Design a protein around this ligand. Structure first.
Ligand SMILES: [Cu+2]
Ligand SMILES: [Cu+2]
Ligand SMILES: [Cu+2]
Ligand SMILES: [Cu+2]
Ligand SMILES: [Cu+2]
Ligand SMILES: [Cu+2]
Ligand SMILES: [Zn+2]
Ligand SMILES: [Zn+2]
Ligand SMILES: [Zn+2]
Lengths: 335, 335, 335
């Protein structure tokens, strides 16, 4: 009975980081309490100044990742401040009943609600806004993130051996549908409401104008690159609430991957590219063996390089000539 | 030798139901006899009166689901009445040889044929029309369905334990390519033949005008919703003969899913969203734990909510506060 | 230490064949040496004379398949002749570090380089060109192929039993983005450089003009069909470096399939249709049981029949009435 369990309070952090948590734990079930505040805002999503009339959990695309253990209860307070214009709610794919909690969390600007559900299944799960009659619009405008439900005894390989990560990153991939006017330039809207009609028209073509990681072209590149070092194991959580994607680490692999994102199933090993179904989150582990800059991208290369679905991981450490060596550098072809 | 085996005759039923059958059986192999009659007809496929010049097995999209056991022989009589205009045939993905039976079942209006094949592999398999030179047109116009070949000892989990369903539903998802005229309104054609050229042009864009379950927007919503009760296990068979889809039960899960649809492989558990490859049928089991209206949809939410790929399941029973509880209903934010 | 190992030299062959190699081997690790020469050339890609300003490894789309065993080192000499116009490189998904080798193999026309890497993971892996700032263009213009890294003790089924193939074929599937002029006819460009801008514009629509196997509509049909006989096991290697596809053998199955292409994972059996993620290569085994012409195609049937993604396998041997029989040929419907 959930009423009798101990409560904990978790402080969320902004993507691409994930809040501190244990993997395997000696702890028993708890009611883990979280709070999120919705923020509607205009965001610049590319390097030429295009804006999106966006909608977010906690001010970020994606929303923050929530981490619990299997058998915990998630207790979320969702706040919709009066400065917003639209009603919102939340649908947790990790939850059972009431359209994922959406029917129980309908909040108009100025309102809040608290939902509890039992996280009875391990895996990474999408959560997203789903207001009746406007579901796709709120999702493509930015209202999604991940709930990770870890097995109480941590991650396991196909033979039941322990797996772990030393750091976790969360990447949300967003297919955007920005309208254009008769001059072929992207439209800039004064309000969220004014963007709706034109956006629906672009959506129905099924062709995104942009496909971005974490809300913007280059959000995870250069100074914003993810980091690691040789010998460190990273967990890359990848969510796509609306459209398929195919993650790939250039120069690396998915050592252990749950592409459907559900940890009670055996992972696959040695993947070059994996597949995240629209409406899901998946998870890959990789242990770095070489230093350098890696590209982490959607391997539809047009979607990555032209539309925005690409980031970087900068890795410290010692180069390994056994794994790879330039035997002969570029030089004139012998005559 | 199939000539010496007992024959049975099966009476088909209209989707979304599936004809009565056993799962695990003490019965030995049989020749199971079915009949289907092709019907070409104009169908209304949305709520604004758009029509499709359609082609069907047995008058429905999808055609009916045929169920046998592994080691049975399927013996189909395919009838193409003289009231039709086009030649047709059938390609069973569950069969071996002769382009799935298509080369042996070419029937002009006024003709019929009978094919037998050994169902030697367990799983859900697409069948579809495939006339030489017009294959995509007959498929996208509605000529597909599912053959389910159950293991003789029923479904099994990854550890070899028994799985079962208490009721089965069949959902065919159809990407449609309806042409428009210069006024931007959908075209209405007097005959099937007259729709061909314009439709091919839309097909080649790869952008469906509509994506529907069971032949129409809302075919499985409201009064037409699927039904179940708390404690009942449902099998959802999902076929897509031409294009990928990603099924999801909102408020629920895929407890056990064969997304590639082949029962000799272990199922995955706890899925939020699964993936049906274009040209295949998959199968998910779920046991209801909460009452209420569930949405069952393609989780490209634009494809679901804008284009039509969404239905409902209405579930009777008792609400379970342990699984989910509204701790605080929507109410003003405390000052 | 790779410096002390024996070297071998492998002579590559043109797709759809694969160079002679052993599956299970008693041999220890070697440094396997290969050479490829890049050729830019204009190619005719359909039956109406459309051209592509193409880029290739070794003159073919796809490039040749390279085969080694797990624990071998691949040592590639990449040659970019002075007759070419563009810089090139190579990214092996089977390799670890330096963006797959791309950072170490940047070759201008008139240059060459030699890369070595350890093939420490079994599976079929894409390799492709990836010059900074032009990655998608070189890939969609034809610069991809497969590296197959076989387990030293050969392929294995889910229970660890031996699997084998008697012949191997390699199929590269290419989504092409050919521009059109104001008359609606495809453009013919005098040089590779002149095709770039217009092609990028088509790419960004995400709609291919053509999707072809092995560089052209019909490249694997008719006189160019693959061949086999009843009782022979074929391995079909299928690569797609940019876009998802869904292979299917009409009249057959994937007996054992590694759709993510990585041999340390158990294969799935009895597939009707499998899924190759954009940016990967997969592998299917099938043992023929019936003679005849089979179609091997992408089962988005519009992509196959309208856009080009279809071939044939012509199979010799004896028809098997137990597997399939025409009980009654097409004939008038009884009155
Ligand atoms: Cu919202
Ligand atoms: Cu959802
Ligand atoms: Cu037909
Ligand atoms: Cu088919
Ligand atoms: Cu190149
Ligand atoms: Cu790549
Ligand atoms: Zn570690
Ligand atoms: Zn039951
Ligand atoms: Zn053999």
């Amino acid at each position: 009975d959930a009423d009798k369990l101990p409560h904990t309070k978790v402080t969320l952090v902004a993507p691409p980081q994930v809040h501190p948590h244990e993997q395997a734990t000696k702890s028993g079930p708890k009611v883990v309490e979280f709070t999120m505040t919705i923020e509607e805002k205009k965001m610049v999503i590319d390097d030429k100044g295009t804006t999106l009339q966006a909608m977010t959990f906690n001010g970020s695309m994606p929303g923050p990742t929530l981490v619990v253990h299997e058998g915990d209860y998630v207790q979320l307070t969702l706040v919709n401040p009066a400065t917003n214009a639209m009603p919102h709610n939340v649908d947790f794919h990790g939850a059972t009943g009431a359209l994922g909690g959406a029917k129980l969390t309908n909040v108009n600007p100025g309102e809040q609600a608290t939902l509890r559900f039992k996280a009875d299944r391990s895996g990474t799960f999408v959560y997203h806004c789903a207001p009746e009659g406007m579901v796709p619009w709120h999702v493509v405008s930015g209202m999604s993130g991940t709930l990770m439900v870890l097995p109480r005894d941590g991650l396991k390989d196909p033979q039941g051996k322990p797996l772990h990560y030393d750091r976790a990153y969360t990447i949300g991939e967003f297919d955007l549908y920005i309208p254009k006017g008769p001059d072929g330039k992207y439209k800039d809207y004064a309000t969220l409401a004014e963007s709706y009609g034109d956006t629906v028209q672009v959506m129905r073509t099924l062709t995104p104008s942009h496909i971005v990681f974490n809300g913007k072209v280059g959000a995870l590149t250069g100074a914003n690159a993810l980091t690691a070092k040789v010998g460190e194991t990273v967990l890359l959580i990848h969510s796509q609430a609306n459209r398929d994607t195919r993650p790939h680490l250039i120069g690396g692999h998915g050592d252990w991957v749950w592409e459907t994102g559900k940890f009670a199933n055996p992972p696959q090993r040695d993947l070059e590219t994996w597949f995240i179904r629209g409406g899901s989150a998946g998870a890959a582990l990789y242990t770095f063996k070489q230093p350098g800059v890696y590209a982490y991208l959607n391997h539809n290369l047009i979607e990555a390089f032209e539309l925005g679905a690409a980031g970087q991981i900068k890795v410290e450490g010692k180069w390994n000539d056994d794994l790879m060596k330039q035997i002969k550098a570029p030089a004139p072809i012998p005559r």
